[model samples]
Target chain A: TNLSDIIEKETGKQLVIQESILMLPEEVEEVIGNKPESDILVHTAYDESTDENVMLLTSDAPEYKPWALVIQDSNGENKIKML
Target chain B: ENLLLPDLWLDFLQLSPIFQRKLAAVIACVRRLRTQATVYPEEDMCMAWARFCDPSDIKVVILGQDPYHGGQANGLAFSVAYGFPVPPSLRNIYAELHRSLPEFSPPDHGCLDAWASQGVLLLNTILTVQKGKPGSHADIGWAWFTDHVISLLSERLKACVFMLWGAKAGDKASLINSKKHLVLTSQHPSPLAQNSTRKSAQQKFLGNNHFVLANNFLREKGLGEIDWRL
Candidate 1:
């Protein structure tokens, strides 16, 4: 499924979807040999069983309260009312 | 106004080794902020544990995002020091109070120590911010300490009222046990919040009877009502 296109349509903002891994400095250093540092906006949520999902947004994306994010998980895609 | 954690709060933190350890490291990070940039709320007003020390005394909890990145933030969330002009968000809070509670007189000044004295825990999630840079300290690890503060209150208190005025504060609603405590929610009181495209943001904030509703819950639980006036 086109999760990236789905999210862009929902949020009306461009995003790059990635698996929720390589988040920690150690994980990044181990896999990519460098930990990237910039103000790249990131938002995250967890499914019912507590498996985490992540969304990477551009720096210009809204960073305010009541962020309506579309999260994909086992029960098909669902929206996180806020994260 | 002492630049120290309140004695009772420090004693309570003894139960959480993680909080004690992280708090020490957080203090070190905050210590470096002064050298690199000017910070808001002054030195003495930074640690709110000094004012709302005892968890047992806290009947209501109102959470804010961060301290005002200006001269107005006097430690407590949504409050200004004695003579500083009230910020726009505080003005909207006053307006909401007047709408919800008829007897409530919106104060000329925004010093809310009166509510603090009567067991309202006015807390900002991130306690410090660099001057003129809103949300500057969001990366400073205050959330680890403050999130635990909310958890401690939820774990200890019974039938308390938790007001989640916006989604930032609303995020902490998971820390509370709704069956044991009352949770009142709305959009942020900022005028901009009213203009948000989401209908959820626009509808709940203006007529939300949060102040009256908080007092009602406390009264039913045999805790006394809050005096919302400054």
Candidate 2:
């Protein structure tokens, strides 16, 4: 299973999966230590009210990990809403 | 039109005689600009340095394009006068901060003096603009003067974070020595710039966690964090 599987299992909803590659700042890396080669695996759900693709961040590990939400709009702009 | 340069800034210019001469010439050019059209920021607060930190005190440099053409500008770049309505660009910045930093609380006012007091230099490349005319003063000597300021900081400061938003400020990246400092980049927070592109999902202004990253870099350097609330 992928990282999105963990998020889907936790949220109990099917989501569109996307593997986004991002430059992780040292500050962020301190938090998310174990990650894939260079890609940030996240799942997106269309938010009707906000018209944004809400992304869920999780780990590929078997155990559950704390997750964060990044709301990306049509402009591809992102804002994180930590959960 | 009389603009007063801060005494401390004059002393700073002492470090570079060439900068002092450049400042004098820029003042003359701004004088000519004033005669052409009404300028924003007025004479007293026209120079954000009127309430700026010394080069040594600067730990973070947030670069902006120019002062707001509206009456809201109070010298500091991306900041409005106390109690003035926060501009959209700044509001976007606040939203980004809220998402990035769990403890950061976006204040109601638009005044950013607190950051400046904590060594955050909120500088605009074009210091002056015509009333209701953005970028009208782009050719004024302010760009040259501010560019020199960045160059000086790169040469003199031990380490600092340069936040360059959009192409205008991004162009100054050439002046910063990445080996000695941190350089952060993203799209401008203006809605126009944000919504203008949809092809790239990773480079948007939001989610970059610029504020958080700046503070982290400063913390690692023992320079302390900037309270980027207002």
Candidate 3:
């Protein structure tokens, strides 16, 4: 449903319905000792303190509690090294 | 304060394997405040963090302001354990949940530990509230520490779905990386969050359909849907 037709969407800001993204990288890290058994989630944000775009790749497995936190150039193309 | 609050909180002490190390400082902070009043009973103190151990186990995260003001309810945030009478606010939650999940049947009691064990992180912004007095411990250390917990989870968990039911919880959505997470924001299920007219219930909460939506996000990602009824 186009929910923005509601009171808020009518007078407030329009809402966008987005599809959940599901993707995993073949990369590995010490957040866990081994490769993940399941998928990984990517959390991308800009850090005001450092003034940089931070891309975090998290392990869906609880065994891998501490996931990877990545920072790199604005253009998603840069290898940035830490895959 | 003694390190001997109870062995129950022992597990709560280490529920999040990732944050356990810093949680020591959090535990010490709370233990010092032990002489003060707490929201949930001693036995129920551990309930907040129960069933939440690994980041992998977590699927859906439910945020609540605090525990029940007065009741036999235990921790686990908006959740209620078995045998406790349903509070009005939680009643509204079940109502919204039913709307979200048509197949779900509201139970006579409102104990959602079953949901918690299934990977629902039922958390309170302020883990401890004064008995019979709302917001008694609002300014306490719980806020500072719980913020770190949210930080830890949001930063570590992958593409987790966050249900921000009210303004405060919704505000916390900013900390999450919007590009990676599915966040649902709406009016709080509490009747107080509603306006004067009865229609507001459906307009605000009843219609949001968060539970179903969260599960749908989970399912579409091949993460498997949550059993909302249990």
TM-score of predicted chain B versus true chain B for each candidate: 0.92, 0.90, 0.80
For each candidate, what TM-score against the reference? 0.71, 0.69, 0.61
Best by TM-score: 1
Question: Lowest summed lDDT over 10 consecutive residues: which window, candidate 1 chain A?
Answer: A18-27
Which stretches in model 2 have alpha-carbon errors above 4 Å?
A: A1-83, B1-3, B15-18, B196-202
lDDT of 2 by residue, A1-83 (tens): 44456556655555433211122322233323333243222333454456555455543223323356555666656565555
Those runs of model 1 whose alpha carbons end farther than 4 Å from true positions after fitting are A1-83, B1-3, B15-18, B196-198
Candidate 1 C-alpha lDDT tens digits along B67-94:
7665667889878777765555676689
Docking quality level of the chain pair in candidate 2:
incorrect
Q: Which candidate ranks first by lDDT, i.e. highest? A: 2
Q: Interface RMSD of the predictions, in order shown?
A: 16.3, 17.0, 19.6
**lDDT score at residue B229, model 2, on the 0-100 scale:** 66
Q: Candidate 1 at B192: error in angstroms?
A: 1.3
Docking quality band of candidate 3, CAPRI definitions:
incorrect
lDDT of 3 by residue, B1-230 (tens): 23332344343334465555454555565556566755454433644455444545677888876555454446677666566545545666788778767688888877776777778888877666445444445565567666766665677667678887755566688777666678887666543233324333223666788888888888887786788784
Question: Each model's RMSD to truth, in Å?
Answer: 12.9, 14.1, 18.4
Candidate 1 vs candidate 2, lDDT winner: 2
* DockQ list for all candidates: 0.02, 0.03, 0.01
Error of 1 at B19 (Å): 2.7
